């Protein structure tokens, strides 16, 4: 990424005036909590208001423990993908101008070695090897395809998941004998199905515990526009259902994608002249709750 701001810029007296506020919204039933921090910036070099919005708080993975009595076949839900989005409304004059993080054009290191050898008193050998070094995240964050001039959205998706030294696996891994072995305890266990999954504590925390999001959106508002507008924030999780099955010879695993979702959408009214944000509307839903 490039930076516009020139070396040792001349700033006018009180170029920036900053106002802060915060606002929250919880869904206790979904275990989702939006904790939002705001900086309104009045900037004499600029003809619009700026609002920096940090979206933080909690989204539970929706993980459910398997029943240990399940004998031939068991299953559980786990958190496979999260989504956060900030948007303004098409009739107002508020645009999303910047945000973090952004999509990663990933980098890695390469090292390639050739070796030759000749020894008698005989014979030769040629060698070749190639090593790649890179960072591997268990979940990866990218932009959601609904991003546009009035909406930023990020998807945080299960990426590379290790299973007791095997893998990494993901939501579609596939073995023509064993299926998707991502959280399968072992191929030959004589445990009940309910007890033949990867131990809870070895699963990544985003899959079984709480995601603590940290996203930034930056919005602009024209100075001539109405002084209040609305901003909608959505925090959502999507759950896959991981299953195992004993087929008489051995264990199979399967991962069913997008078997449920739980979503918490809040609308805040932002007063750009008084620098206040108030929650005015909240909506929680779950596609297939238990019961």
């Amino acid at each position: 990424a490039q930076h516009i701001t020139p070396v040792s810029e001349k700033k006018v007296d009180d170029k920036i005036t900053l106002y802060k506020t915060t606002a929250t919204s919880d869904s206790d039933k979904l275990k989702i909590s939006q904790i939002l921090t705001f900086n309104f910036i009045k900037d004499k070099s600029y003809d619009k208001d700026t609002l920096i919005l940090k979206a933080a708080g909690n989204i539970y993975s929706g993980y459910t423990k398997p029943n240990p009595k399940d004998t031939i076949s068991s299953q559980f839900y786990w958190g496979s993908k999260y989504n956060i989005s900030i948007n303004s409304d098409s009739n107002d004059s508020v645009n999303v101008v910047d945000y973090a993080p952004k999509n990663q054009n990933e980098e890695f290191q390469v090292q390639q070695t050739v070796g030759y050898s000749y020894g008698g008193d005989g014979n030769g050998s040629k060698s070749f090897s190639e090593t790649i070094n890179y960072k591997q995240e268990s979940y990866r964050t990218s932009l959601d395809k609904r991003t546009n001039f009035k909406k930023i959205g990020w998807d945080v998706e299960a990426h590379k998941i290790m299973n007791n030294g095997w893998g990494p696996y993901g939501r579609d891994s596939y073995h023509s004998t064993y299926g998707n072995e991502m959280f399968l305890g072992s191929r030959q266990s004589n445990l009940n199905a309910g007890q033949n999954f990867l131990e809870y504590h070895k699963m990544p925390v985003l899959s079984r515990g709480n995601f603590n999001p940290e996203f930034i959106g930056v919005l602009s508002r024209k100075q001539n526009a109405a002084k209040k507008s609305k901003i909608t924030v959505t925090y959502q999780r999507e759950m896959d259902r991981y299953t195992n099955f004993w087929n008489q010879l051995h264990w199979i695993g399967n991962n069913y994608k997008d078997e449920n979702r739980a979503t918490h959408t809040s609308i805040y009214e932002v007063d750009w002249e008084n620098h206040t944000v108030k929650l005015i509307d909240t909506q929680s839903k779950e596609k297939n709750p238990m019961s």
Binding site: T21, T22, T24, D26, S33, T37, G57, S125, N133
Partner: protein
């Protein structure tokens, strides 16, 4: 973004409260933040102090060959308020996305030929990992849980049933069925020094005071070391666990925060 408190004047207060029954001290620092740019009252709470591990060793009832070590599998740190005019607007530490460094090599050696593959993962670990167990706009609870321990032949997990099992299967002393103190981590043999921070806001010129409750404590597991003997007469100890044997052994203190006068009253404690 600039956090609430950046650039602000602080008014500092401290309270230190200990419990003999639970073996806990809470050393809390309250920094009222006078952030002229923020339109709410703000307070930063630094939560420190000391939670004794209370690790103990005893003989199992009516036998000489099973002995016990009761030890803190997890430490508990929690902050809550019921005041609707208060929000939790920041807390540290938070859960992070798990990351590892990978190096993968593929190669061959054509002399008698051969293909080789190698893959290395590398990452850091700690004895105890801190995770956010639950958090909403009025509370946050952390669990600090046994994770990974160096032993002579590698590392062992906080869930391994033989963790801490020792070397002396005919000793009469229960202590001797478990590894000695210099092989125990400090959070099992002495205790934990929490350091957690939360920032809270309060809707201005409403009220006098809000009540916060801060809970520190432990969940204890019991490991049983049982003498077993090979057919050919060799004796050693094997571990089993009661996981979550004594849960929420916790010391909760209530603090009443007066937002206007910057005072704290330490009211109740359990």
């Amino acid at each position: 973004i600039e956090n609430i408190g950046d650039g602000a004047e602080v008014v500092k207060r401290t309270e230190d409260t200990s419990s003999d029954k639970w073996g806990v001290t809470q050393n809390i620092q309250f920094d009222f933040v006078k952030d002229k740019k923020y339109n709410k009252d703000a307070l930063i709470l630094k939560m420190q102090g000391f939670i004794n591990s209370k690790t103990t060793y005893y003989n199992y009832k009516n036998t000489d060959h099973i002995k016990a070590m009761r030890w803190p599998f997890q430490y508990n740190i929690g902050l809550k308020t019921n005041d609707p005019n208060v929000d939790l607007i920041n807390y540290l530490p938070k859960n992070k996305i798990d990351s590892v460094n990978v190096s993968q090599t593929l190669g061959y050696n054509i002399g008698n030929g051969s293909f080789n593959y190698s893959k290395t993962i590398s990452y850091n670990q700690q004895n105890y990992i801190s995770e956010v167990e639950r958090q909403n706009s009025k509370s946050v609870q952390w669990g600090i849980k046994a994770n990974s321990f160096i032993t002579s032949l590698g590392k062992m997990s906080g869930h391994d049933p033989n963790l801490f099992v020792g070397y002396k299967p005919y000793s009469q002393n229960p202590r001797d069925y478990f590894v000695p103190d210099n092989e125990l981590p400090p959070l099992v043999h002495s205790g934990f020094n929490p350091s957690f921070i939360a920032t809270v806001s309060h809707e201005k010129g409403s009220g006098d005071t809000s009540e916060f409750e801060i809970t520190y404590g432990r969940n204890m597991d019991v490991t049983h070391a049982t003498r077993r003997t090979t057919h050919y007469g060799n004796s050693y100890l094997e571990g089993s666990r009661i996981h979550n044997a004594f849960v929420n052994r916790n010391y909760t203190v209530k603090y009443e925060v007066n937002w206007k006068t910057h005072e704290i009253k330490v009211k109740g404690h359990n």
